[model samples]
Target: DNRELWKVLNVDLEKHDEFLAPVPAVYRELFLNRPNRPRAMAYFDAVVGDIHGIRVHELYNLKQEGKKVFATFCVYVPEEIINATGSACIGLCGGAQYTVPAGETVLPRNLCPLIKSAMGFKIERICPYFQVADYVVGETTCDGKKKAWEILNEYIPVYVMELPQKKEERDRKFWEEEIKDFAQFVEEKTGVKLNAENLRAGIEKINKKRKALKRLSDLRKHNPAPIHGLDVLLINQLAFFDDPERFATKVNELCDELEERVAKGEGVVSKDAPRILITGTPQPIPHWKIHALIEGAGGVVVGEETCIGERYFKDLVEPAADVEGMLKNIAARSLKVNCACFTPNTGRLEDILSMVQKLQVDGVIHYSLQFCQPYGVESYLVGRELERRNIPFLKLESDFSEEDQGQLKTRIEAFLEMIK
Candidate 1:
């Protein structure tokens, strides 16, 4: 049945296999080596495969029920607005290698793999999530994404939000206005008004998810982290695409189990294992190579400073009095996100530094996708600051291809050995 779905979607099944061949073995090795893995992993494993299949089925079911589906690439797109409008917002970033070649046909190969994979999904029509979108919300976070959205507009109904390059009151006001405009756009498209009650309810639901993620992340602070980085990374990737409420509940269940493991001084890796803090570009679903390579190199990733990592759930939307007030609160919280898109993004530097100290990591790995100028360029600043503080740091540039895995593993192994 899944094979039939792939054929209908025009996906090259053999090529896809070639791309994913290393994934199962990598995950299996990680899991088999991990000690004291929680039983809740079985639940996570069951739903993980459904990301493109059953998850798409759920979205189509909602569509059949007359609900709109808004596909988003960045966290800048307010999920609250989509929920308020009685529409579902699903994350659409692609991390698979199979689609990169297809994307290169239309765009230059020098672009970031994330954008390339995203475009490839639409171009090849392999991703059901992309194909099922009623609206694709794009954000002008960086130059590559801005231009990529232009091409994306040719294929879908794309609503591009202009993100500010500066973090000032003027920029915040501009961002607030943009959010208001987006809210109106969604309302008009879906014929659903975002009334006060629905907006507040949406805010409450998203806040619950943030709280649950915070609880899970807090558990990592324990010495000899009760959970492995690969497992936690999987949960983080799931945050973007999974149903908010269901994801929250399941993550909290996993957290409860991890809490007991921490109390008993248990961990997946050795207590003195080299702890790593990874920062930079978000690792979308199926992009577990970095985490796997780090663990295989005898290091444990204790924290991440990427969009889908800590930044995704670090802050909660403050409560407001009315609809207008709610919009302002959302705008304020959204503006606090320290993306590389903003000029002089010192906030992210501070976040990385603080996370390194908080997680008590032995070193920081600045991981950036090749040709992702924003984070790639920003890594210099991150590395300089970490160096000044005498913190061990490594800057790595990679693409979706597995050809460089050996080199990456060698570099990571040496870095881990240095820290050790």
Candidate 2:
């Protein structure tokens, strides 16, 4: 059955072999030595299988039932539009080293790992979710992605959205129009017109999910955070692909347990361990290397300001009674995202400063994937701002490879010592 699906996806078995060969051992070692593994994590682990296993099956079933499955790379794409169309959206960005070489076949070697890995997944058919996408939504948030979509079009149906680079009234209007166009495109593809009621329902579901995430994040503010950073990172990564409602419920349940743990003064790290905040590019699923390195170096990650972290759920779309009003609200909320994609992105700097105070972390680790120019280049400003505020900050650049593990460990250890 899997082979037939591979054939349908035009997967090259040889390429797939090259891709899957190196990942198992890496994953095994990481999960094997996980510190303070929570019971709730086991359930999410099962849901998000080795590589979209059970979750892909669930999405495939949705497709088999005549519903559309849309794959998205950025959080800027409105999930409400997909839900309003009675379809589903699953995040398709890649964060593994396996697919980078394959992507390098078509993309330049200097391109960011994220774009390369995403291209590699489609080309090598390593990700079932990528293969199952009826359409992949690409946003022009960065120049690399804007061009990467052209190459991606060769393998899958692509819907490109041109995101504005400035945050202004005109930009908001432009984004609102783009969202309306996206809704129309989804409707055309799925034959489901997005009525006001449907849009409202979609917003409500997503808001509930966001609120649950916020509740969990807010708990991290407690001294000696009750949850491990790696555990919380796993849950945040799962949010991209898991069923939103079920994921929210599970998170809430986990929070219920954690609240009691906090009351009892239980924590995953030492009470006086250095509290660290990670801010920069998104850390997709399976990209737990930094989180592990931080904890291993005797520091605790108290918060993250990336896409898969607080940014994914920081804002909620206000309830709107009309379709245009709903679109405008979503547009406004998405535009508020402080990604480095926009010019004069002072909001991101402000957010980092705010999180430093709010999470009460002793230091900030500004992590950016290699070649991700937007966040990579923005680190200078972040470091400068943190320094001005007398906050200890370290800018680390890395890719998906493990070759730099020792170097990273040493640096992190030194930083932790200084903070202490």
Candidate 3:
């Protein structure tokens, strides 16, 4: 079994040494296929390891074992509440199109990729876990997510958290109430619950992963990058779909090796380049796309705040360490609560400024998915805010499906030139 192979390979998630050689091959095999066939191949590889085979009743087992689990209809749902619940909250990305033969007719062509993915699963009678979730949360973050819940609830009890797309005080309060209620509902449904000890444990576990990933990120500081952009992207898969500790160990191992390589000046990036920071929503493009584009433009990305990227360092509320107090504090500090998604057409400009300052970003990029109204609106505000600050920012919109590389290349080159 591949799981046995992983164990045999002593693949430490926290270190990069063990899997350093295969990182590029893995990323190429997963993220770069014309329509993301590499993603399916990677998923198949994981399933071979029994790591990706999810079952519906596993939710109950997860609760019984005190394993934290929270469900979301789409990736845009705030993971903060799940962190607060002392569970590993995973946003569901359903099956591929060919996996289910017939859902395209019922679902609109304009629906988001995630929703279409879920519909594909439903049409094929896949993803039984979606049928037996402890509680599935959905948000009005986009039309696809909204429609997903409408369809999902017909099968199981689902919680809809109204995400405000406009930045307004009233809407903020509404979301606060919505989140608080969602927490309470989860607590009620599960006999197992979160307390200070478990919350602290969860936070510590998440932080451990962050620290390891940060160490790996730091290895690129070398003149001849010890790790290739492709290698980094491949190792990132362990971050998304594996055990946190195991993933951390493997990443750290790779970093330890890369650190030495960097010391020797031997990797993908050259020395003496402008270190750039990548930002925007979770993009479906392989990380290599960004790395290649930036480096090709004489830029090196030192940091990223993408969906999968920012999550590498999200806030974790300690249950025992003044849970309510900390939650309130974190909530108060959250940029999402006041984001344009909550306020519709207008977004809080201050948050954009804060993010840029925090990340020490030289420029910002908005990678909005096509037909995503909320993000489209948010990008407008983001562009204006960055322009006003004289901080470079660019907007690149695309559907998650692989297409229009020629256009993307033009957009990326223009943005890089403008920023440079």
Top candidate when judged by TM-score against the true structure: 2
- Candidate 2 matches the true fold with a TM-score of 0.95
Relative to the true structure, candidate 1 reaches a TM of 0.95
- The pairs that clash in candidate 1 are none
Please give, for residues 155-185, the per-residue lDDT of candidate 1 as tens digits. Answer: 8789988988898889889999999999899
Arranged by TM-score with the best first, the candidates are 2, 1, 3
Model 1 stretches astray by more than 4 angstroms:
1-35
| lDDT tens digits by residue: candidate 3, 1-420 | 433333432333222233234444644453444231212234324532433234323444565677556666443344554554655565455423343234565677776554666666544443433433456677776666677677767655678877655556775676666656765766665444666565455556766776787677655545444544444554553454455666677676666666566566564444544545555555432334555565556665655555455444443333335656544533443434333345343333554555556545565666655566766766775677678778877777654343466787787767666664
Q: Give per-model TM-scores.
A: 0.95, 0.95, 0.67
The clash count of every prediction, one per candidate, is 0, 0, 40
The lDDT of each candidate is: 0.84, 0.84, 0.53
- The positional error of residue 335 in candidate 2, measured at the CA in angstroms, is 0.9
Q: For candidate 2, lDDT tens digit of each residue in 338-360?
A: 88888899888888888888888
